Amino acid sequence: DLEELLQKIKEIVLKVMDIGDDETIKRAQKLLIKAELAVQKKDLKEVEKLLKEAEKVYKEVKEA
Ligand SMILES: N[C@]12C[C@H]3C[C@H](C[C@H](C3)C1)C2
Ligand SMILES: N[C@]12C[C@H]3C[C@H](C[C@H](C3)C1)C2
């Protein structure tokens, strides 16, 4: 499930790169790198948190 959550994070980062401004893109790219590190550490709770964070960042762009 670590890897699958990382996939969902990557999918959202792609959507942010498609519609977000460059500051939001940098925020999402840092989130992705953090998520890769958390996967490597097998820190499932952190990967779950970063997915919620990505969902929120994206929702806010999409709804602005
Ligand atoms: N302006 C930027 C373009 C691209 C995405 C992001 C980080 C780097 C590379 C600089 C913003
Ligand atoms: N692995 C990366 C994919 C993409 C380009 C670069 C910076 C970010 C976004 C993480 C390497």
Question: CA 53 to CA 45: how far, in whole Å?
Answer: 12
Ligand approaching nearest to the C-alpha of 36: 2
Q: Which residue's CA lies nearest to atom 6 of ligand 2?
A: 29
Resolution of this deposited model, Å: 1.5
Neighbours of 28 (CB within 10 A): 23
Ligand 1 contact, 25 CB (< 6 A): yes
